[PDB]
Scaffold this active site. Structure first.
Site, PDB file in Angstrom:
ATOM      1  N   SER A   3       0.845  -1.187   0.000  1.00 34.62           N
ATOM      2  CA  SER A   3       0.000   0.000   0.000  1.00 34.62           C
ATOM      3  C   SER A   3       0.883   1.240   0.000  1.00 34.62           C
ATOM      4  O   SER A   3       1.659   1.454   0.938  1.00 34.62           O
ATOM      5  CB  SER A   3      -0.936   0.004   1.208  1.00 34.62           C
ATOM      6  OG  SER A   3      -1.851   1.084   1.138  1.00 34.62           O
ATOM      7  N   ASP A  48      -2.888   5.026  -3.224  1.00 34.40           N
ATOM      8  CA  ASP A  48      -4.008   5.810  -2.712  1.00 34.40           C
ATOM      9  C   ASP A  48      -4.138   7.144  -3.442  1.00 34.40           C
ATOM     10  O   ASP A  48      -5.249   7.577  -3.764  1.00 34.40           O
ATOM     11  CB  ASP A  48      -3.840   6.035  -1.208  1.00 34.40           C
ATOM     12  CG  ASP A  48      -5.137   6.432  -0.528  1.00 34.40           C
ATOM     13  OD1 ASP A  48      -6.133   6.679  -1.236  1.00 34.40           O
ATOM     14  OD2 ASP A  48      -5.160   6.498   0.718  1.00 34.40           O
ATOM     15  N   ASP A  61      -5.117  -2.443  13.009  1.00 34.16           N
ATOM     16  CA  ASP A  61      -4.472  -3.753  13.012  1.00 34.16           C
ATOM     17  C   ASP A  61      -4.921  -4.590  14.205  1.00 34.16           C
ATOM     18  O   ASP A  61      -5.262  -5.772  14.060  1.00 34.16           O
ATOM     19  CB  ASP A  61      -2.954  -3.576  13.020  1.00 34.16           C
ATOM     20  CG  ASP A  61      -2.479  -2.592  11.971  1.00 34.16           C
ATOM     21  OD1 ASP A  61      -3.069  -2.561  10.871  1.00 34.16           O
ATOM     22  OD2 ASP A  61      -1.522  -1.840  12.250  1.00 34.16           O
ATOM     23  N   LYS A  82       6.103  11.816   0.446  1.00 34.28           N
ATOM     24  CA  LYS A  82       6.727  11.419   1.704  1.00 34.28           C
ATOM     25  C   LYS A  82       7.461  10.089   1.610  1.00 34.28           C
ATOM     26  O   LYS A  82       8.390   9.849   2.389  1.00 34.28           O
ATOM     27  CB  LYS A  82       5.678  11.339   2.822  1.00 34.28           C
ATOM     28  CG  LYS A  82       4.937  12.644   3.074  1.00 34.28           C
ATOM     29  CD  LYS A  82       3.942  12.501   4.214  1.00 34.28           C
ATOM     30  CE  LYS A  82       2.828  13.534   4.123  1.00 34.28           C
ATOM     31  NZ  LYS A  82       1.922  13.283   2.967  1.00 34.28           N
ATOM     32  N   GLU A  83       7.070   9.226   0.674  1.00 29.99           N
ATOM     33  CA  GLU A  83       7.743   7.950   0.431  1.00 29.99           C
ATOM     34  C   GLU A  83       8.367   7.989  -0.955  1.00 29.99           C
ATOM     35  O   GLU A  83       7.649   7.865  -1.963  1.00 29.99           O
ATOM     36  CB  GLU A  83       6.768   6.780   0.548  1.00 29.99           C
ATOM     37  CG  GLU A  83       6.169   6.606   1.935  1.00 29.99           C
ATOM     38  CD  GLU A  83       4.906   5.760   1.935  1.00 29.99           C
ATOM     39  OE1 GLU A  83       4.842   4.768   1.182  1.00 29.99           O
ATOM     40  OE2 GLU A  83       3.969   6.097   2.688  1.00 29.99           O
ATOM     41  N   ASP A 141       4.559  -2.861   4.113  1.00 27.76           N
ATOM     42  CA  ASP A 141       4.644  -1.430   3.911  1.00 27.76           C
ATOM     43  C   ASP A 141       5.669  -1.134   2.822  1.00 27.76           C
ATOM     44  O   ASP A 141       6.460  -1.994   2.427  1.00 27.76           O
ATOM     45  CB  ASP A 141       5.025  -0.727   5.212  1.00 27.76           C
ATOM     46  CG  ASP A 141       4.767   0.760   5.164  1.00 27.76           C
ATOM     47  OD1 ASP A 141       4.289   1.244   4.116  1.00 27.76           O
ATOM     48  OD2 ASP A 141       5.041   1.444   6.171  1.00 27.76           O
ATOM     49  N   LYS A 180      -8.498   5.299   5.639  1.00 29.32           N
ATOM     50  CA  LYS A 180      -7.103   5.580   5.311  1.00 29.32           C
ATOM     51  C   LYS A 180      -6.371   4.337   4.819  1.00 29.32           C
ATOM     52  O   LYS A 180      -5.651   4.393   3.815  1.00 29.32           O
ATOM     53  CB  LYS A 180      -6.383   6.175   6.525  1.00 29.32           C
ATOM     54  CG  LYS A 180      -7.138   7.268   7.287  1.00 29.32           C
ATOM     55  CD  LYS A 180      -7.900   8.227   6.374  1.00 29.32           C
ATOM     56  CE  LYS A 180      -6.954   9.125   5.590  1.00 29.32           C
ATOM     57  NZ  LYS A 180      -7.657  10.302   5.008  1.00 29.32           N
ATOM     58  N   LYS A 181      -6.539   3.210   5.502  1.00 27.98           N
ATOM     59  CA  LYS A 181      -5.780   2.014   5.149  1.00 27.98           C
ATOM     60  C   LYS A 181      -6.610   0.741   5.076  1.00 27.98           C
ATOM     61  O   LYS A 181      -6.297  -0.121   4.247  1.00 27.98           O
ATOM     62  CB  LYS A 181      -4.631   1.803   6.146  1.00 27.98           C
ATOM     63  CG  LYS A 181      -3.635   0.731   5.738  1.00 27.98           C
ATOM     64  CD  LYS A 181      -2.424   0.725   6.655  1.00 27.98           C
ATOM     65  CE  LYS A 181      -1.467  -0.397   6.292  1.00 27.98           C
ATOM     66  NZ  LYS A 181      -0.230  -0.358   7.118  1.00 27.98           N
TER      67      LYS A 181
HETATM   68  O1  LIG Z   1       4.821  -2.321  17.213  1.00 26.59           O
HETATM   69  C1  LIG Z   1       3.665  -1.912  16.494  1.00 26.59           C
HETATM   70  C2  LIG Z   1       2.476  -1.747  17.412  1.00 26.59           C
HETATM   71  O2  LIG Z   1       2.946  -1.051  18.577  1.00 26.59           O
HETATM   72  C3  LIG Z   1       1.957  -0.912  19.599  1.00 26.59           C
HETATM   73  O3  LIG Z   1       2.436  -0.186  20.744  1.00 26.59           O
HETATM   74  C4  LIG Z   1       3.144  -1.016  21.657  1.00 26.59           C
HETATM   75  C5  LIG Z   1       4.582  -0.516  21.759  1.00 26.59           C
HETATM   76  O4  LIG Z   1       5.274  -0.805  20.550  1.00 26.59           O
HETATM   77  C6  LIG Z   1       5.320  -1.147  22.933  1.00 26.59           C
HETATM   78  O5  LIG Z   1       6.574  -0.500  23.114  1.00 26.59           O
HETATM   79  C7  LIG Z   1       4.501  -1.025  24.211  1.00 26.59           C
HETATM   80  O6  LIG Z   1       5.172  -1.665  25.250  1.00 26.59           O
HETATM   81  O7  LIG Z   1       3.230  -1.616  24.011  1.00 26.59           O
HETATM   82  C8  LIG Z   1       2.446  -0.943  23.015  1.00 26.59           C
HETATM   83  C9  LIG Z   1       1.088  -1.603  23.017  1.00 26.59           C
HETATM   84  O8  LIG Z   1       1.045  -2.701  22.114  1.00 26.59           O
HETATM   85  C10 LIG Z   1       0.762  -0.133  19.067  1.00 26.59           C
HETATM   86  O9  LIG Z   1      -0.255  -0.096  20.061  1.00 26.59           O
HETATM   87  C11 LIG Z   1       0.221  -0.756  17.785  1.00 26.59           C
HETATM   88  O10 LIG Z   1      -0.791   0.077  17.231  1.00 26.59           O
HETATM   89  C12 LIG Z   1       1.337  -0.961  16.773  1.00 26.59           C
HETATM   90  O11 LIG Z   1       0.845  -1.671  15.641  1.00 26.59           O
END
Ligand SMILES: OC[C@H]1O[C@@H](O[C@H]2[C@H](O)[C@@H](O)[C@H](O)O[C@@H]2CO)[C@H](O)[C@@H](O)[C@@H]1O
Ligand SMILES: OC[C@H]1O[C@@H](O[C@H]2[C@H](O)[C@@H](O)[C@H](O)O[C@@H]2CO)[C@H](O)[C@@H](O)[C@@H]1O
Lengths: 727, 80, 63
Positions: free
Chosen positions: A104, A140, A462, A110-111, A306, A281-282
């Protein structure tokens, strides 16, 4: 012949039982200490005591939620040899299950197109039967820059792929291969390797020049609009109003490479976006890709990526098929998840970009329960799970039309259990209907985004997408190849880091407010194990721990400025458990690093970044969440304004330390006792808060400067002198 | 359009040299000019080595007449 | 701590000898256990000092 193609090895029993015992002991000690705090009042000033005990209750609950789902961590190791022996057995047509890959792309501004081209080339040069992969790129922005970049990449692939296949290249991505410091003749044996490598490097440089020329040409917008080579203008002139458009490169119709083996198909898609309809958005682009694939080429599984994430290990899909194709231990798995590895990170972790603790402790130890949580990119899904169907082994057309679309061809294409396409066969109908599937009013009276595909959440979709299928009877599975499967670029500066944590925290906050909340979603019906529910609750309510945290960061200094007490001190009873709490925590950390393999430095980097990022942006994300909820400035804030709460807290704590020093000056040894604990608490807070600010304000190692810190100390000394002379 | 326009300070830049170049023929001609610069460096190093040893009677110009700068503290004006 | 200045003298030489031995022994272990420059880590050495302080406190309360 009857072996499993993978095995789950539990962590060694000698290296895990002390960890479990220390966890149990810490639970008991924390419970007893909490009882002691509850029983004992203060009488002199109950407000600070009540605030502190509430903060510590919340901290204990958060500790329970985070640490409990770490029981029985596991690792998994796979046997590709058996897979190739039983499916790729010579003398029969190849029987490996096909896939589609989803890339996507949002906006080339930006990319850069080169980064996307690297991902496309790494996907194309993968080791897997060519007649069983296909790449779907969803642009997109409907811009022509990415279209011409893909046209260039589909021409350079004919040279990049055979050379990569012959000599077995390690990264299989041009820029990430020709920029390796390691020697490139370590294990190469073919006599002709050097000449052909030095001939291919020049071709790659020329391709880079062509891409740079395309970017320069596209940088200037024409008045009337863009022009295609044939004659008719580009339909994407109006970015906010353009029809759907799909095109196909490198397929069976397209020409072969240099040796003669045809390339994997590469289809470029762009959904119509009429103004006046809600566009996501995604999740919307991924849903459009899923719906297009069902008409073009239907595959049981699908991988997503990505733009910045390329494929490092060339057998990642082949290493996921040992999990997704076993009828025994793979019949009930819904997706395979790989850890996010980043490239270009410095030896020093300036602001916790490596993410060791999560991907190494939490998800590895959570693999024992229904597998990990679906992060953003780098994961292989099973198609039949996205449609909402439960795992197997425990007139009509109208319900299908409510469930997903009114397109008969795609509905028929979904009823096939594994692979295959509807018997239309003729490319005319498929290529005329796949453009109908990406219409702007397709997802109306259907369940797309609410029960199927990717859940139409708020900002991040996600976690909800993974949880919707974990709530059923589906399992997921975690994978750690020795050679990392997917490597992606890392954020450059700390401002993007802070925006990123704000976005994640706000997504979690908004998740904690819908009907899909893990706290009470599907309590009846079960199908979700309790430990996974605790893990989801942790992943949801992690930002809220920043609300009490601020109070607990200020409460020591608050009492230090005047009261200088929190609880009555008794050495006979309280001191033993007080020390035992810290001892249990230290033993817990030691036993964590015994079996996790996480370095000490990374462990403390994450441990301090906990508070550092919690007090900076998580309380903000809470403010957005509550403000938006109560509503029923708003956009991203400046990078500087995010870091003023920690600075205020550190300044207040330093002022409290100065006040304590002044009191010690007034002290005549008779009061030399009680203030030690308050000094210790304030010092703990200061030690947690300070190093990040040291790193920010100083570009040199160790201390930022010399005379400026010396003069700051001098100013503090003179300020405390003036305070003492005027008490 | 070269950035430094000085050979040694251009061919010794750590930054990538194809960041914004667009001409199709840039790579081949740059790799052809680097060799010419190296050969020029070799020629200069040879000239220094030859000049390092002073002859007894004095320096000799290519045409035939000796170099007027044999006596460093007494030589006529000369422009070319 | 038990000393009342009357015994503040003799222990200086013993402290010096033990300090000489410690200064000779320590930097190699610092280099081994730490992959970073200067100090190996930060909070771990701080907590080791904290544990030593609490251990000496418990020794003092039970001499
Ligand atoms: O790594 C992708 C994922 O990160 C999520 O946040 C984490 C964070 O990376 C970690 O350092 C912390 O300890 O926990 C949070 C909660 O999972 C984030 O919430 C996701 O949306 C993202 O896809
Ligand atoms: O093991 C570290 C763990 O600490 C958690 O908070 C601790 C910490 O000691 C302090 O915040 C409080 O006084 O006690 C709790 C109890 O564990 C923290 O929430 C975790 O993220 C961290 O992994």
């Amino acid at each position: 012949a009857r072996q499993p193609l993978s095995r789950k090895v539990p962590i060694a029993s000698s290296k895990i039982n002390p960890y479990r015992m220390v966890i149990v002991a810490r639970l008991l000690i924390l419970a007893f200490f909490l009882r002691y705090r509850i029983l004992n009042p203060v009488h002199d000033a109950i407000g600070l005591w009540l605030t502190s005990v509430i903060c510590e209750i919340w901290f204990a609950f958060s500790w329970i939620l985070d640490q409990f789902p770490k029981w029985f961590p596991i690792d998994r190791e796979t046997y590709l040899d058996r897979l190739s022996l039983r499916y790729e057995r010579e003398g029969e047509p190849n029987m490996l299950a096909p896939v589609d890959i989803f890339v996507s792309t949002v906006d080339p501004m930006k990319e850069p197109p080169l980064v996307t081209a690297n991902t496309v080339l790494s996907i194309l040069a993968m080791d897997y039967p060519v007649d069983k992969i296909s790449c779907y790129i969803s642009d997109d922005g409907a811009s022509m820059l990415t279209f011409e970049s893909l046209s260039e990449t589909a021409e350079f692939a004919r040279k990049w792929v055979p050379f990569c296949k012959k000599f077995a290249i390690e990264p299989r991505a041009p820029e990430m291969y020709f920029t390796l410091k390691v020697d490139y003749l370590k294990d190469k044996v073919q006599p002709t390797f050097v000449k052909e490598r030095r001939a291919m490097k020049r071709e790659y440089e020329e391709f880079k020049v062509r891409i740079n020329a395309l970017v320069a040409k596209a940088q200037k917008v024409p008045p009337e609009g863009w022009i295609m080579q044939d004659g008719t203008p580009w339909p994407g002139n109006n970015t906010k109003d353009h029809p759907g458009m799909i095109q196909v490169f490198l397929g069976q119709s397209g020409g072969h490479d240099t040796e003669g083996n045809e390339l994997p198909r590469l289809v470029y898609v762009s959904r119509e976006k009429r103004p006046g309809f809600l566009h996501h958005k995604k999740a919307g682009a991924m849903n459009a890709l899923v719906r297009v694939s069902g008409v073009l080429t239907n595959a049981p599984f699908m991988l997503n990526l990505d733009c910045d994430h390329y494929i490092n290990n060339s057998k990642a899909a082949r290493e996921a098929m040992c999990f997704l194709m076993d009828p025994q231990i793979g019949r009930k798995v819904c997706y395979v998840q790989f850890p996010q590895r980043f490239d270009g990170i410095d030896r020093h972790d300036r602001y916790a970009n490596r993410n060791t603790v999560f991907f190494d402790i939490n998800m590895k130890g959570l693999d024992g329960i229904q597998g990990p949580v679906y992060v953003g990119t780098g994961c292989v899904f099973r198609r039949q799970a996205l449609y909402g169907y439960e795992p197997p082994k425990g007139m009509s057309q109208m319900n299908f039309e409510k469930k997903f679309g009114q397109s008969a061809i795609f509905v028929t294409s979904t009823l096939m259990d594994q692979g295959g396409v509807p018997p239309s066969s003729s490319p005319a109908a498929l290529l005329k209907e796949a453009i109908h599937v990406i219409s702007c009013g397709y997802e109306d009276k259907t369940e797309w985004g609410s029960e199927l595909g990717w859940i139409y959440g708020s900002i991040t979709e996600d976690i909800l997408t993974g949880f919707k299928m974990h709530c059923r009877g589906w399992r997921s599975i975690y994978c750690m190849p020795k050679l990392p499967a997917f490597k992606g670029s890392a954020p450059i500066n700390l401002s993007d880091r802070l925006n990123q944590v704000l976005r994640w925290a706000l997504g979690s906050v908004e998740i904690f407010f819908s009907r899909h909340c893990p706290a009470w979603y599907g309590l009846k019906g079960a199908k979700l194990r309790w430990l996974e529910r605790f893990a989801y609750v942790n992943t949801t309510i992690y930002p809220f721990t920043s609300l009490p945290l601020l109070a607990y960061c200020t409460l020591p200094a608050i009492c230090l400025l005047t009261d200088k007490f929190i609880m009555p001190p008794i050495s006979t009873f309280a001191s033993l458990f007080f020390i035992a709490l810290f001892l249990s925590i230290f033993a817990t950390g030691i036993l964590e690093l015994r079996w996790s393999g996480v370095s000490i430095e990374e462990w403390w980097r994450n441990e301090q970044f906990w508070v550092i990022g919690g007090i900076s942006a998580h309380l903000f994300a809470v403010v957005q969440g509550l403000l938006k909820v109560l509503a029923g400035e708003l956009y991203t804030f400046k990078w500087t304004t995010l870091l003023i709460p920690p600075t205020t807290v550190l300044i207040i704590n330093l002022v409290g330390v100065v006040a304590g020093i002044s009191d010690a000056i007034n002290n005549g040894y008779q009061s030399w006792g009680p203030l030690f604990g308050k000094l210790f608490f304030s010092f703990w807070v200061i030690v947690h808060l300070y190093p990040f600010l040291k790193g920010l304000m100083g570009r040199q190692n160790r201390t930022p400067t010399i005379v400026v810190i010396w003069s700051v100390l001098l100013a503090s000394i003179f300020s405390l002198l003036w305070v003492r002379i005027d008490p």
